[PDB]
């Protein structure tokens, strides 16, 4: 995130960190059993980390569960990046609590000018 600010600890409870040795991509918990992400983030082995704020320290509120199934969209296109979505099923259901919560899917599409909040541990420069 370039030009952003540091989020309040656990203020984005649906934010997960995809880990394969180190954090490589973000994701969102939309179900106690399912995480949604970007198909271009695909790796055959992935560990999902929930309840994270500082990815470099065990603060205590984290739950690490390996993905059991990773399903990218059948029409995902690597050239155009059309249908850049992937679903990940956890091997064990996450325990929903204060620092770990699901995010609602959309009721409808958003009108232009709608303010949104974007988060992640990506490059800041």
């Amino acid at each position: 995130i370039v030009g952003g600010y540091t989020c309040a600890a656990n203020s984005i409870p649906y934010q997960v960190s995809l880990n394969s040795g180190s954090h490589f991509c973000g994701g969102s918990l939309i179900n106690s059993q399912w995480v949604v992400s970007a198909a271009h983030c695909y790796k055959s082995r992935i560990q999902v980390r929930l309840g994270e704020h500082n990815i470099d320290v065990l603060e205590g509120n984290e739950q690490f569960i390996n993905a059991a199934k990773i399903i990218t969209h059948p029409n995902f296109n690597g050239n155009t990046l059309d249908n850049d979505i992937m679903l990940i099923k956890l091997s064990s259901p996450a325990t929903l609590n204060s620092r770990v919560a699901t995010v609602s899917l959309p009721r409808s599409c958003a009108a232009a000018g709608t303010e949104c909040l974007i988060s992640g541990w990506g490059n800041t420069k």
């Binding site: 992640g120 541990w121 490059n123």
Partner: protein
């Protein structure tokens, strides 16, 4: 904008959904109906490498997935996101079958 540095702490950014003409003006012949632009045309505020797959939540609903762009925070190159509102059925269908 220039350089590199992946944070240990979670970063946030408030940005508005851009109209598809503004989105389409920035990337001629490359924006599909399954894509939306969110951000600022002036640059300086954007998602980047490592934020991929991350949430774009507006009004309590997940409207986007960090997908792509030309670099990060470039003037007139806002970020492009997967349009989640077009995928609810696939997501429900998939969760039911697996």
């Amino acid at each position: 904008s220039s350089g590199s540095s992946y944070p240990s702490l979670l970063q946030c950014l408030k940005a508005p959904v851009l109209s598809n003409s503004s989105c389409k003006s920035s990337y001629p012949g490359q924006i599909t109906g399954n894509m939306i632009c969110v951000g600022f045309l002036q640059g300086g505020k954007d998602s980047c490498q490592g934020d991929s797959g991350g949430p774009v939540v507006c009004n309590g609903q997940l409207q986007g997935i960090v997908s792509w762009g030309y670099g990060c925070a470039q003037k007139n190159k806002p970020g492009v996101y997967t349009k989640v509102c077009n995928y609810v059925n696939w997501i429900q269908q998939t969760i039911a079958a697996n």
